[PDB]
């Protein structure tokens, strides 16, 4: 039962989010919500080399409600601060899994050490929706160190797979999840292939960061391109026509309505108009 390729998408125009994040936006819920549940958004920042500066490049403080933001750093360093009294820097290999939930107020920027030295900068920020019963859950954070994320070798010297969230071959990703899903960081060596089995009905997407991937023997994906698969199927194949770096996102759909606006993604317009009212008063 092959997870058919249902769509493949060319690389978007890169655009600036603040002054620290040059992102190519892979998908957004308003057109991909039903298709990609539980995932809501994926920004691919960089790769871009920054020079030394005294500036603090990044994004200003802004609210979030009703979902989770995941930062996956490949190069560079980002400090995050949230109103839950929390903070910290996330570096190469590190992951942060922030639950905004009932409401959070965060800014993210280049760490002071990265500002001083500069260098290559590359990361992925992913939005993960919450079940309706947890939309007003308490905001929290998980700082996950590179050393805490499994790194399995694929068979036949095909490359690596890092389980950020979910499970693969008995390795449970360190990221806690309200909903069944996988977030996999895959490195694949040229001329090697691997097959995967995934749950039936799980919405699945592949995103190539580097290299040239052959998907299901049918679709060729390249840098900053997205593969959207048939959820009904159960298995999957990838071959790297070039040394590839990709993300595999899968997950059990959340069969609940999505009503979102900007930084608020809720279930009802009344909850959206409610969030816009809570933020303009100062509840956040
Ligand atoms: Mg944010």
Q: Other CB atoms closer than 10 Å to residue 160's CB: what's the count?
A: 15
Q: Could you tell me which residues come within 8 angstroms of residue 247 by beta carbon, excluding any fewer than 6 positions away?
A: 42, 72, 124, 183, 184, 185, 186, 206, 207, 209
Report how far ligand 1's centroid is from the alpha carbon of 65 (Å).
Answer: 10
Using an 8 Å Cβ cutoff, are 220 and 213 in contact?
Answer: yes
Phi, psi of 64 (to 5 degrees): -145, 145
How far, in Å, is the centroid of ligand 1 from the Cα of 40?
Answer: 13
CA dist 39 → 57, 61, 129, 252, 265 (Å) = 27, 23, 6, 10, 12
Dihedral sign computed on CA atoms, order 171, 174, 180, 186? negative
Domain that holds residue 175: 147-253
6 alpha carbon – ligand 1 mean position (Å): 30
Give the residue numbers of the binding site for Fe(3+).
Answer: 62, 106, 108
Asked if 137 contacts 99 with a C-beta cutoff of 8 angstroms, the reply is yes
283: left (phi over 0), alpha (psi -120 to 50) or beta: alpha
3-state DSSP helix/strand/coil % of the chain, to nearest 5: 15, 55, 35
Please tell me what DSSP assigns to residue 78.
E
Closest CA to 267 of 136, 126, 179: 136
For residue 243, report the distance from its CA to the centre of ligand 1, in Å: 32
Spacing, Cα 228 to ligand 1 middle (Å): 25
- Choose among 265, 243, 264, 244: nearest CA to 256: 265
Phi and psi of 276, rounded to 5°? -60, -30
Neighbouring C-beta atoms of residue 11, cutoff 10 Å: 15
Under 8 Å between Cβ of 271 and 101: no
Cα–Cα dist 94/196, whole Å: 25
C-alpha 221 to ligand 1 mean position (Å): 28
Breaks in the chain (C–N beyond 2.5 Å) sit after: none
* CB 226, CB 9: distance < 8 Å: yes
Contact 104, 82 (CB under 8 A): yes
* Rounded distance from Cα 237 to ligand 1 centre (Å): 34
Q: Give yes or no for a contact between 190 and 242, defined as CB atoms under 8 angstroms apart.
A: yes
**Whole-number Å distance between alpha carbons of 20 and 26:** 18
Integer CA distances (angstroms), 141 to 15, 84, 105, 159, 258, in order:
27, 9, 12, 30, 23
- Annotated binding residues, written as ranges, equal 62, 64, 106, 108
**Nearest alpha carbon to residue 258 among 105, 26, 66:** 66
Helix (H) or strand (E) holding 265: strand 264-266
Dist. CA 33–CA 93, nearest whole Å = 28
* Experiment used for this model: X-ray
E strands, 76-157, are: 78-82, 86-90, 95-99, 104-110, 119-129, 143-144, 151-153
Alpha-carbon distance 127 to 52, whole Å?
A: 30
Residue with tokens 């969030």: 275
3-state secondary structure at position 30 = helix
Scan for tokens 């090697």, then name that residue.
192
Cβ-contact 166, 177 below 8 angstroms: yes
Report the CATH number at residue 168.
2.60.120.10
Find out whether 60 and 75 touch, Cβ atoms under 8 Å.
no
For residue 63, how far is its CA from the centre of ligand 1 (angstroms)?
7
Q: What residues form the annotated binding site for Mg(2+)?
A: 62, 64, 106
Give the span between the Cα atoms of 17 and 273, in whole angstroms.
24
Calculate how far, in angstroms, residue 64's C-alpha sits from the geometric centre of ligand 1.
6
> Which residue has 């990709």 as its token pair?
246
Question: Which residues are annotated binding-site positions for Cu(2+)?
Answer: 62, 64, 106
* Overall size of the chain counted in residues: 284
**φ, ψ (nearest 5 deg) of residue 134:** -110, 10
What SS3 state is found at 5? strand
């Amino acid at each position: 039962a092959m997870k058919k390729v249902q769509g493949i998408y060319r690389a978007p125009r890169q655009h600036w989010v603040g002054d620290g994040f040059p992102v190519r936006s892979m998908f957004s819920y308003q057109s991909h919500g039903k298709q990609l549940s539980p995932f809501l958004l994926l920004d691919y920042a960089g790769p871009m080399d920054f020079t030394p500066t005294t500036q603090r490049r990044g994004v200003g403080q802004h609210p979030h409600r009703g979902f989770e933001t995941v930062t996956i750093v490949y190069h560079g360093e980002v400090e995050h601060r949230d109103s839950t009294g929390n903070g910290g820097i996330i570096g190469p290999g590190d992951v942060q899994w922030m639950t905004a939930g009932a409401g959070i107020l965060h800014e993210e920027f280049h760490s002071d050490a990265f500002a001083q030295k500069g260098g290559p900068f590359e990361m992925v920020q992913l939005w993960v929706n919450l079940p309706a019963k947890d939309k007003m859950t308490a905001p929290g954070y998980q700082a996950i160190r590179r050393e805490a994320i499994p790194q399995v070798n694929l068979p036949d010297d095909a490359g690596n797979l890092r389980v950020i969230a979910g499970e693969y071959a008995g390795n449970i990703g360190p990221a806690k999840t309200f909903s069944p899903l996988n977030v996999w960081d895959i490195r694949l060596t040229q001329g090697k292939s691997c097959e995967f089995s995934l749950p039936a009905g799980w919405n699945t997407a592949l995103i190539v960061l580097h290299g040239t991937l052959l998907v299901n023997g049918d679709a060729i994906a390249r840098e900053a391109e997205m593969v959207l698969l048939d959820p009904t199927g159960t298995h999957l194949s990838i071959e790297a026509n070039n040394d590839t770096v990709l993300l595999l996102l899968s997950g059990e759909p959340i069969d609940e309505p999505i009503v979102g606006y900007g930084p608020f993604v809720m279930n009802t317009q009344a909850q959206i108009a409610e969030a816009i009212a809570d933020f303009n008063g100062g509840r956040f």
